[PDB]
Amino acid sequence: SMEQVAMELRLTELTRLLRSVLDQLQDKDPARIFAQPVSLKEVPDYLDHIKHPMDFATMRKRLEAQGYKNLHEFEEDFDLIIDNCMKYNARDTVFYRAAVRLRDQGGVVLRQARREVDSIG
């Protein structure tokens, strides 16, 4: 149908906007702490602690499969990256501190993304 196509064009454009958002968020992680999944070879007990692991490469795979239907779903995944880290790692670690800085700096980006998503529809 023509409607299914119009819907698919909207999703494609949301994917375009979320790709830009993702790039801007990942720039706030210059140490690349959150770039890839925590290695289960190097942290074998990880899934005993963290039940829903997340990282930027995993988000990128979902994004490019047009797997985010709305900004809320994308934000859920970003928040997992941060929240998983702040639980597994102690306050006095470079990992915890990296997550706090990502959260703080990301907030600004995500605030305007929400306005853009609502605005453009």
mmCIF file of C-alpha atoms in Angstrom:
data_model
loop_
_atom_site.group_PDB
_atom_site.id
_atom_site.type_symbol
_atom_site.label_atom_id
_atom_site.label_comp_id
_atom_site.label_asym_id
_atom_site.label_seq_id
_atom_site.Cartn_x
_atom_site.Cartn_y
_atom_site.Cartn_z
ATOM 1 C CA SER A 1 0.000 0.000 0.000
ATOM 2 C CA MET A 2 0.913 3.620 -0.254
ATOM 3 C CA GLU A 3 0.358 3.953 3.530
ATOM 4 C CA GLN A 4 2.929 1.153 4.302
ATOM 5 C CA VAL A 5 5.445 2.997 2.124
ATOM 6 C CA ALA A 6 4.842 6.395 3.846
ATOM 7 C CA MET A 7 5.231 4.602 7.224
ATOM 8 C CA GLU A 8 8.496 3.032 5.971
ATOM 9 C CA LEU A 9 9.770 6.475 4.803
ATOM 10 C CA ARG A 10 9.034 7.891 8.379
ATOM 11 C CA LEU A 11 10.955 4.955 9.949
ATOM 12 C CA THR A 12 13.840 5.563 7.554
ATOM 13 C CA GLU A 13 13.966 9.199 8.469
ATOM 14 C CA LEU A 14 13.744 8.356 12.233
ATOM 15 C CA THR A 15 16.672 5.974 11.586
ATOM 16 C CA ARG A 16 18.559 8.857 9.950
ATOM 17 C CA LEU A 17 17.947 11.104 12.960
ATOM 18 C CA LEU A 18 18.811 8.328 15.531
ATOM 19 C CA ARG A 19 22.037 7.607 13.617
ATOM 20 C CA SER A 20 23.096 11.237 14.089
ATOM 21 C CA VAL A 21 22.015 11.062 17.812
ATOM 22 C CA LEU A 22 24.036 7.874 18.258
ATOM 23 C CA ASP A 23 27.121 9.470 16.753
ATOM 24 C CA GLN A 24 26.817 12.475 18.995
ATOM 25 C CA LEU A 25 26.390 10.238 22.101
ATOM 26 C CA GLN A 26 29.294 7.992 21.218
ATOM 27 C CA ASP A 27 31.554 11.069 20.864
ATOM 28 C CA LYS A 28 30.948 11.667 24.556
ATOM 29 C CA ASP A 29 32.761 8.341 25.182
ATOM 30 C CA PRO A 30 36.206 9.117 23.827
ATOM 31 C CA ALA A 31 37.861 6.327 25.821
ATOM 32 C CA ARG A 32 35.585 3.817 24.013
ATOM 33 C CA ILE A 33 34.548 2.231 27.301
ATOM 34 C CA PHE A 34 31.020 1.597 25.965
ATOM 35 C CA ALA A 35 31.885 0.802 22.320
ATOM 36 C CA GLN A 36 31.592 -2.976 22.468
ATOM 37 C CA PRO A 37 29.879 -5.663 24.672
ATOM 38 C CA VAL A 38 31.502 -6.506 27.944
ATOM 39 C CA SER A 39 33.575 -9.632 27.075
ATOM 40 C CA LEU A 40 32.194 -12.815 28.738
ATOM 41 C CA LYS A 41 35.644 -14.338 28.205
ATOM 42 C CA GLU A 42 37.221 -11.559 30.328
ATOM 43 C CA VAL A 43 34.258 -11.071 32.734
ATOM 44 C CA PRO A 44 32.817 -14.591 32.963
ATOM 45 C CA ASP A 45 30.373 -13.818 35.850
ATOM 46 C CA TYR A 46 28.932 -10.713 34.030
ATOM 47 C CA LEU A 47 25.464 -12.106 33.288
ATOM 48 C CA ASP A 48 25.070 -13.098 36.927
ATOM 49 C CA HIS A 49 25.172 -9.340 37.662
ATOM 50 C CA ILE A 50 23.694 -7.674 34.519
ATOM 51 C CA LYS A 51 20.642 -9.235 32.986
ATOM 52 C CA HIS A 52 20.335 -7.010 29.949
ATOM 53 C CA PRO A 53 23.823 -6.027 28.665
ATOM 54 C CA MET A 54 24.077 -3.184 26.178
ATOM 55 C CA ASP A 55 26.754 -1.257 24.293
ATOM 56 C CA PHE A 56 27.082 1.071 21.330
ATOM 57 C CA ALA A 57 27.938 -1.598 18.687
ATOM 58 C CA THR A 58 24.850 -3.596 19.687
ATOM 59 C CA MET A 59 22.708 -0.379 19.368
ATOM 60 C CA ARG A 60 24.191 0.330 15.988
ATOM 61 C CA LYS A 61 23.190 -3.161 14.742
ATOM 62 C CA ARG A 62 19.615 -2.594 15.870
ATOM 63 C CA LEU A 63 19.570 0.890 14.419
ATOM 64 C CA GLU A 64 20.748 -0.245 10.948
ATOM 65 C CA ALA A 65 18.129 -2.985 10.908
ATOM 66 C CA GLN A 66 15.603 -0.105 11.521
ATOM 67 C CA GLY A 67 14.891 -1.784 14.819
ATOM 68 C CA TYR A 68 14.025 1.353 16.864
ATOM 69 C CA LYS A 69 10.339 2.296 16.340
ATOM 70 C CA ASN A 70 10.479 5.498 18.397
ATOM 71 C CA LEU A 71 13.021 7.561 20.425
ATOM 72 C CA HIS A 72 11.821 5.973 23.725
ATOM 73 C CA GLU A 73 13.134 2.517 22.644
ATOM 74 C CA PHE A 74 16.513 4.083 21.677
ATOM 75 C CA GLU A 75 16.750 5.886 24.976
ATOM 76 C CA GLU A 76 15.942 2.672 26.855
ATOM 77 C CA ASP A 77 19.043 1.062 25.286
ATOM 78 C CA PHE A 78 21.245 4.131 26.019
ATOM 79 C CA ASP A 79 20.115 4.147 29.620
ATOM 80 C CA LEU A 80 21.038 0.400 29.905
ATOM 81 C CA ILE A 81 24.596 1.179 28.896
ATOM 82 C CA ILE A 82 24.872 3.744 31.731
ATOM 83 C CA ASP A 83 22.843 1.971 34.375
ATOM 84 C CA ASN A 84 24.549 -1.472 33.839
ATOM 85 C CA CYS A 85 27.951 0.216 34.322
ATOM 86 C CA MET A 86 26.991 2.151 37.438
ATOM 87 C CA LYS A 87 25.817 -1.091 39.063
ATOM 88 C CA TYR A 88 28.714 -3.437 38.048
ATOM 89 C CA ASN A 89 31.450 -0.944 38.777
ATOM 90 C CA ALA A 90 32.104 0.930 42.017
ATOM 91 C CA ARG A 91 31.924 4.723 42.331
ATOM 92 C CA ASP A 92 35.697 5.074 42.506
ATOM 93 C CA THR A 93 36.392 3.535 39.076
ATOM 94 C CA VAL A 94 37.177 4.969 35.699
ATOM 95 C CA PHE A 95 34.240 2.966 34.327
ATOM 96 C CA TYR A 96 31.611 4.401 36.728
ATOM 97 C CA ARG A 97 32.984 7.897 36.242
ATOM 98 C CA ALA A 98 32.868 7.453 32.413
ATOM 99 C CA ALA A 99 29.194 6.501 32.657
ATOM 100 C CA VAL A 100 28.323 9.538 34.771
ATOM 101 C CA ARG A 101 30.000 11.873 32.248
ATOM 102 C CA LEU A 102 28.234 10.112 29.342
ATOM 103 C CA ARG A 103 24.881 10.481 31.058
ATOM 104 C CA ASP A 104 25.476 14.137 31.808
ATOM 105 C CA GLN A 105 26.747 15.056 28.359
ATOM 106 C CA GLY A 106 24.230 12.859 26.580
ATOM 107 C CA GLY A 107 21.283 14.593 28.329
ATOM 108 C CA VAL A 108 21.764 17.742 26.238
ATOM 109 C CA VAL A 109 21.727 15.767 22.921
ATOM 110 C CA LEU A 110 18.711 13.705 23.903
ATOM 111 C CA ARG A 111 16.754 16.787 25.005
ATOM 112 C CA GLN A 112 16.959 18.296 21.503
ATOM 113 C CA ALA A 113 16.399 14.952 19.780
ATOM 114 C CA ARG A 114 13.042 14.682 21.575
ATOM 115 C CA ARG A 115 12.039 18.155 20.441
ATOM 116 C CA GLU A 116 13.120 17.183 16.804
ATOM 117 C CA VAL A 117 11.214 13.919 16.830
ATOM 118 C CA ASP A 118 8.000 15.649 18.052
ATOM 119 C CA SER A 119 8.593 18.659 15.742
ATOM 120 C CA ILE A 120 9.229 16.755 12.425
ATOM 121 C CA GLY A 121 6.627 14.142 13.596
#
